[PDB]
């Protein structure tokens, strides 16, 4: 029913997750009801073989902050089948964050949420700091992006 969900193809597809970011990465699998499920994390510069399936949807996040990362230069990874026996690579990288978002990341990394509103900054930035990245926000945006260019 949710458009962004894995399909139960039951068709094995071997993938290699390759973390080419400086972040500890959390692979996130969107299950058949479109709910996110975590898998074990990947240290920077580490690769790992995974047994996945045709049509299964994956996202990748900073394991500690949930910032979004790219996989093969886009936000969603969906394997097809292994071509002539070769593993499918999912190359995970850092996006070029806006300077504002990167600043929000660094301030969130240094200040407890309960203290955001004690910071002496333009007050619109309080809600910006509190609007933490998260998978469901991105799923909403990605879904309406999909229907928008679908029409």
């Amino acid at each position: 029913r949710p458009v962004l969900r894995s399909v139960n193809s039951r068709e094995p597809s071997q993938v290699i997750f390759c973390n080419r970011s400086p972040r500890v990465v959390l692979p996130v699998w969107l299950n058949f009801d479109g709910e996110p499920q975590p898998y074990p994390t990947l240290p920077p510069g580490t690769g790992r073989r995974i047994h996945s399936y045709r049509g299964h949807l994956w996202l990748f996040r900073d394991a500690g902050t949930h910032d979004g990362l790219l996989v093969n230069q886009t936000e969603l990874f969906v394997p097809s089948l292994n071509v002539d026996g070769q593993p499918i690579f999912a190359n995970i990288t850092l996006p070029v964050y806006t300077l504002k978002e990167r600043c929000l990341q660094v301030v969130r990394s240094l200040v407890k949420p309960e203290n955001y509103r004690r910071l002496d900054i333009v007050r619109s930035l309080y809600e910006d700091l509190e609007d933490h990245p998260n998978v469901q926000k991105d799923l909403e945006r990605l879904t309406q992006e999909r229907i928008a260019h679908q029409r």
Partner: peptide, 17 residues
Amino acid sequence: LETLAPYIPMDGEDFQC
């Protein structure tokens, strides 16, 4: 049918990528 979720192979070893 049963749903088949992704899984990590037991003989898998992390490597430098």
